RNA sequence: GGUUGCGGCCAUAUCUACCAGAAAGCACCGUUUCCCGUCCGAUCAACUGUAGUUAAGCUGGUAAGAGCCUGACCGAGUAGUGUAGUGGGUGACCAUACGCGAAACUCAGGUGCUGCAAUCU
RNA sequence: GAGAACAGAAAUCUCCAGUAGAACAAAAGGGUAAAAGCCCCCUUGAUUUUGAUUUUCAGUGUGAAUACAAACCAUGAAAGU
RNA sequence: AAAUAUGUAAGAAGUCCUUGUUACUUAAUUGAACGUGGACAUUUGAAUGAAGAGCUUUUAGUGGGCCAUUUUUGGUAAGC
């Protein structure tokens, strides 16, 4: 009958860990107009640094 | 039965503050938002095209996407036994900048102004914060302030 | 009255309590697309007083508003307009003035020369191919209403013909009917000049000439003949393109004398 | 006195309220298009009544606003059948007044067999000049206290001009 | 210092009742040929700064004021409160030790600051 | 509230006060005054292609929305919607 | 308008400078994001602790709960 007894103890027993973010986050929900130009800028830089 | 809407039990949480009705003032739009700012989420219930859910009120997130008249924030949320990164899009009226990071940033630009100065001076100086330290051996005075006694009051006329 | 009525009373914003600023329209004007991060959103303010016409270009910041360049119509005697300081064609000349002044300040007045000849037609400024894009400036008109053929759109006409890009459509320019759905160049070249104030001059030359001496009292004494108002509006239009720059008027004093006079009148605390 | 403080007239409204729509209502429009010379306007319904024939959103009555000199001469002809004599109860404390008549043909107008026998309500409003800042759009504001038209103003101006002889009771 | 345009903060910016404002600007005002809109050139529309004054608007002072804001050896370390006991009381509730700590009242001060541009005898 | 013939507790009309005390289809709450209310004007963004996110949640389904991109449009003088 | 409870931050995946990319954006050789290259490289920037950190696979039992301080809600009160 929905008693939340012991539930905080269960969730704290193995710890409530952080999602551990990274460098370079995922570009799933970003602006697509920005995303295409970022892809083209990366491809321009990838040859412009290779050719020097 | 029961009810779990999108705005349930948000009576006293979405209403405007006293004498703060009307169209929101135009400084809330000119404040720009880059990708990486630590922003609060305090909603105002005037504009509704983009009101957050009742859980994200008051919480603090990080901007990760910027688009037309709206920004995407990232919030860690506790569910069950772990955190989940809820990303969510919000219109710019519900997003105020947080001065917690911007107090730290000016102190970084200040300790870059004292540490790099004194390390070229020749004294390697301290820069960390320190908590409220205990006091020093102080000789108090007694010149006109005589230490005058006290006696606690009885219960007569108190009744 | 009561004090509980004044306790819970909410005053509006100050420039709405005065009644001057449409805080609704300003909202849509100053918000920009946030992917365009710190780009200013320029506006063309035009405001019509009783005997003076204002034309400014504004940016926007939190610390007030910022004026990019300004233009009045009480300074047109520098180029050669004496009377008709608040005229449809005066607003057209002010629109031709502010365009050239902003483009001369920006360095775009040679690449965007606008239209040298004028013929009375609806056109838009085009992007120069592999060039700097046109200067994009959006209108605003106050609390004053919009209506077809109005005095306000003379400034827009002068701006779009001076060569800065203002978005506009022809369904309010004078001569655009609801039935033809087309502008009339015969009415347009007569409202961008004195072709209707002179058309009133002729129909007061033979209706009651004392009223013609009443309204146009400073006209005929200055010898303002109606048959060359088109040419006197034409003549300073090229000197606008020659010299549009704001040179400052030579003052009589240096603000201390104004302060020393007005402080005795000002009736302090 | 001084310029721009006098109690000049501003408009007069020619109200007629009969209470039913049809031939009598278009005759109520015809008796004002041949009195005021302007295109008249009618009135929609306000609220509930079963005893006046008026139910919601029907044309029921007529009134014409008129400015300029024509309102002044319509008042001046309405007073030479009403003896240039108006009451004191007829005069408001807010700077305007009005008066009733019980026929139009008393005024000097010429009869037509298809008109009718029904009166009229001449209400009039006036102001000191400078009272467009109440009306306008940009930078509005209520006029000052000393400039406000009141009962004493509109009575002691009517005694001077157009010969009140007002029945103070 | 004055005025105007566009403003940021949105009552220290308001409401009231008065009083006063040289220049300049604003405003009221004049006219209905044309664009133009109404029942009505009153709002709106347009022409002309001409016929006329600061009476209004507006700005600035002023008031045994109404508010509003601000600070309290103010209310008071009071009320409510986290914590402990084999503490009391039959109970309601309490007194303790360790801590955090208001508010309405009450008194004292104040009645807009300011950005950009233009203009000023 | 001040007022105007029949005209009134109330027919229409004029003016002063009017922080919403009214309206917004519906339950209660929240929101709104040159509007989101009331009249008028033009309309079909109630459209097409699929994604991402939020809510109840295993972060399944169903419903509901929120912010974009690509077109095609409406409105508007225009910003934008 | 409190007390307990909660969000975030207290740096190296940082601070600042120089100047490349791009089909997005600016009126613009502006701005966005990511970069190259040098400097800050010790107090790598609040306290206390770390008896190691992170990540994956698979599967047993469970999926009938009671008691007490405290807050409280139905009931006319409970070892309800």
| Minimal Cβ distance to A18: which of B67, B83, B89 | B83
Assigned token pair, D129? 């000049």
Assigned token pair, B112? 């870059």
Q: Which of D40, D67, D38 is nearest to D125 (CA)?
A: D67
Give the integer Cα–Cα distance in Å for B115 and B109: 10
Give the integer Cα–Cα distance in Å for C219 and C227: 13
Mapped onto helix, strand or coil, the DSSP state of residue D158 is helix
Residues near D168 by Cβ (< 8 Å), separated by ≥ 6?
Answer: D88
Q: Residue C39: what are its φ and ψ, rounded to 5°?
A: -85, 135
Chain B partners within 8 Å of A25 (Cβ): 64, 74
Cross-strand bridge partners of residue B61 = B39
- Tokens 């058309």 locate to C199
Q: State the number of CA atoms in the 13 A half-sphere of B16 facing the CB.
A: 13
Give the integer Cα–Cα distance in Å for A14 and A9: 9
CB atoms within 10 A of CB D99: 18
Assigned token pair, B83? 């955190």
Contact B84 A14 (CB under 8 A): no
Give the integer Cα–Cα distance in Å for C136 and C127: 11
CB C186 within 8 A of CB C226: no
Give the integer Cα–Cα distance in Å for D138 and C47: 11
Question: Which H or E element spans position C268?
Answer: none
Assigned token pair, D79? 């007073």
CB C79 within 8 A of CB C240: yes
Nearest nucleotide, C1' to the C-alpha of C39? G26
B:109-148 Cβ neighbours of strand F under 7 Å: none
Give the integer Cα–Cα distance in Å for B100 and B38: 9
Burial label for D133, CB within 10 Å (0-12, 13-18, 19+), is exposed
Secondary structure letter of residue B97 according to DSSP:
B
Assigned token pair, C137? 């400036």
Contact C34 B30 (CB under 8 A): no
Helices C229-242 and C197-205, packing angle to 10 deg:
160
Contact B83 A11 (CB under 8 A): no
Q: Which of D111, D89, D98, D87 is nearest to D63 (CA)?
A: D98
- Tokens 């209506």 locate to C147
Instruction: Provide the CA C65 distance to its chain's centre, in angstroms.
Output: 18
- Tokens 């106050």 locate to C142
Check whether residue B38 has its CB closer than 7 Å to nucleic acid strand G.
Answer: yes
Q: How far is CA C256 from CA C190, C260, C261, C266, in A?
A: 47, 6, 9, 15
Q: Which of B44, B21, D140 is nearest to C16 (CA)?
A: D140
Contact A19 B83 (CB under 8 A): yes
Contact A14 B65 (CB under 8 A): no
Mapped onto helix, strand or coil, the DSSP state of residue D132 is coil
Burial label for D157, CB within 10 Å (0-12, 13-18, 19+), is middle
* Separation in Å: F40 C1' and C257 CA: 56
A:23-52 Cβ neighbours of strand F under 7 Å: 28-29, 31-33
CB C13 within 8 A of CB C26: no
Give the integer Cα–Cα distance in Å for C198 and C179: 28
Q: How far is CA A43 from CA A34, A50, B35, C98, D63, in A?
A: 14, 11, 22, 44, 77
Check whether residue C164 has its CB closer than 7 Å to nucleic acid strand G.
Answer: no
Q: Which of C219, C4, C249, C240 is nearest to C99 (CA)?
A: C240
Give the integer Cα–Cα distance in Å for C45 and C137: 10
Chain A partners within 8 Å of B76 (Cβ): 18-19
CB B53 within 8 A of CB B43: no
Q: State the number of CA atoms in the 13 A half-sphere of C63 facing the CB.
A: 0
Residues near B98 by Cβ (< 8 Å), separated by ≥ 6?
Answer: B38, B39, B40, B60
From A37's Cα to the closest Cα of chain C, the distance in A is: 13
**Method in brief:** cryo-EM
From C218's Cα to the closest Cα of chain D, the distance in A is: 25
CB atoms within 10 A of CB B1: 2
CB D43 within 8 A of CB D63: yes
Give the integer Cα–Cα distance in Å for D96 and D154: 7
B:3-32 Cβ neighbours of strand G under 7 Å: none
Contact C144 D137 (CB under 8 A): yes
Give Rg (Cα) of chain D. Answer: 18
Residue at shortest CA–C1' distance from E1: C259
CB C157 within 8 A of CB C173: yes
Cross-strand bridge partners of residue D87 = D167
Nearest nucleotide, C1' to the C-alpha of D63? F13
Assigned token pair, D27? 């005759």
CB B41 within 8 A of CB B57: yes
Q: Which of C52, C45, C216, C53 is nearest to C139 (CA)?
A: C45
Q: Sheet harboring D120-126: ordered strands across?
A: D65-66, D9-15, D120-126, D96-101
Q: How far is CA A33 from CA A29, B35, B56, B89, C35, in A?
A: 12, 15, 28, 17, 10
Q: Which residues of B touch C (CB under 8 A)?
A: 19, 21-23, 25-27, 29-34, 66-71, 92
Q: What is the dihedral of CA C74, C184, C230, C243, to 10 degrees?
A: 50
What C21-27 contacts at long range (C-beta under 8 Å, 24+ apart), as own/partner pairs, is C22/C142, C22/C143, C23/B23, C23/B26, C24/B23, C25/C140, C26/B26, C26/C140, C27/B23, C27/B26, C27/B29
Check whether residue C32 has its CB closer than 7 Å to nucleic acid strand G.
Answer: no
């Amino acid at each position: 009958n929905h008693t939340a007894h012991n539930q905080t103890r269960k969730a704290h027993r193995n710890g409530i860990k952080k999602p551990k973010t990274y460098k370079y986050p995922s570009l799933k929900g970003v602006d697509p107009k920005f995303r295409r130009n970022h892809k083209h800028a990366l491809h321009g830089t990838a040859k412009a640094l290779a050719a020097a | 039965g029961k009810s779990h809407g999108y705005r349930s039990r948000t009576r006293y949480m979405f209403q405007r503050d006293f004498r703060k009705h009307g169209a929101v003032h135009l400084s809330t739009y000119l404040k720009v938002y880059k990708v990486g700012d630590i922003v609060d989420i305090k909603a105002n219930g005037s504009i509704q095209k983009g009101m957050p859910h009742k859980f994200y009120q008051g919480k603090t997130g990080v901007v990760y996407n910027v688009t037309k008249s709206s920004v995407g924030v990232i919030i860690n949320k506790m569910v069950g036994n772990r955190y989940l990164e809820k990303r969510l899009n919000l219109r710019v009226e519900h997003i105020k900048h947080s001065k917690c990071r911007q107090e730290f940033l000016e102190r970084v630009k200040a300790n870059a102004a004292k540490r790099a100065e004194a390390k070229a001076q020749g004294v390697a100086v301290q820069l960390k914060r320190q908590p409220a330290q205990p006091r020093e051996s102080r000789i108090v005075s007694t010149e006109g302030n005589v230490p005058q006694t006290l006696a606690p009051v009885p219960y007569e006329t108190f009744i | 009255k009561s004090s509980a009525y004044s306790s819970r009373f909410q005053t509006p914003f100050r420039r709405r309590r005065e009644g001057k600023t449409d805080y609704y329209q300003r909202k849509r004007l100053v918000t920009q697309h946030k992917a365009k991060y710190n780009t200013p959103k320029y506006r063309l303010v035009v405001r019509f007083t009783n005997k003076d016409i204002i034309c400014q270009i504004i940016s926007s910041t939190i610390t007030g508003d910022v004026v990019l360049a300004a233009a009045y119509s009480h300074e047109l005697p520098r180029y050669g307009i004496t009377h008709g300081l608040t005229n449809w064609a005066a607003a057209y000349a002010t629109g031709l003035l502010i365009a050239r002044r902003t483009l001369q300040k920006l360095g775009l007045d040679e690449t965007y020369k606008g239209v040298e000849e004028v013929e009375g037609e609806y056109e838009l400024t085009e992007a120069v191919e592999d060039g700097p894009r046109p200067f994009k400036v959006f209108l605003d008109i106050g609390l004053q209403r919009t209506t077809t053929g109005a005095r306000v759109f003379g400034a827009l006409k002068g701006a779009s013909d001076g060569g800065l890009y203002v978005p506009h459509s022809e369904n309010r320019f004078p001569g655009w009917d609801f039935e033809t759905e087309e502008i009339d160049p015969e009415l347009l070249r007569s409202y961008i000049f004195g072709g209707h104030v002179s058309q009133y001059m002729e129909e007061l030359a033979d209706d009651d000439e004392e009223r013609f001496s009443e309204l146009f009292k400073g006209y005929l004494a200055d010898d303002i003949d109606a048959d060359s108002l088109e040419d006197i509006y034409t003549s300073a239009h090229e000197a606008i393109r020659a010299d549009p720059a704001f040179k400052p008027t030579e003052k009589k004093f240096t603000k201390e004398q104004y302060a020393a006079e007005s402080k005795k009148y000002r009736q302090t605390k | 006195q001084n310029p721009m403080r006098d109690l000049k007239i501003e408009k007069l409204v020619l109200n007629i309220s009969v209470g039913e729509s049809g031939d009598r209502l278009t005759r109520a429009s015809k008796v004002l298009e041949q009195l005021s010379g302007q295109t008249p306007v009618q009135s929609k319904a306000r609220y509930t009544v079963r005893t006046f024939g008026i139910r919601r959103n029907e044309k029921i009555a007529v009134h014409v606003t008129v400015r300029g000199p024509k309102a002044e001469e319509i008042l001046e002809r309405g007073l030479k059948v009403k003896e240039y004599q108006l009451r004191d109860r007829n005069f408001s404390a807010t700077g305007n007044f009005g008066f009733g008549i019980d026929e139009h043909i008393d005024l000097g107008i010429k009869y037509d067999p298809s008109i009718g026998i029904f009166g009229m309500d001449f209400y009039v409003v006036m102001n000191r000049p400078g009272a467009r800042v109440t009306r306008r759009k940009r930078c509005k504001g209520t006029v000052g206290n000393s400039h406000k038209t009141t009962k004493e103003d509109t009575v002691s101006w009517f005694k001077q001009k157009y010969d009140a002889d007002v029945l103070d009771k």
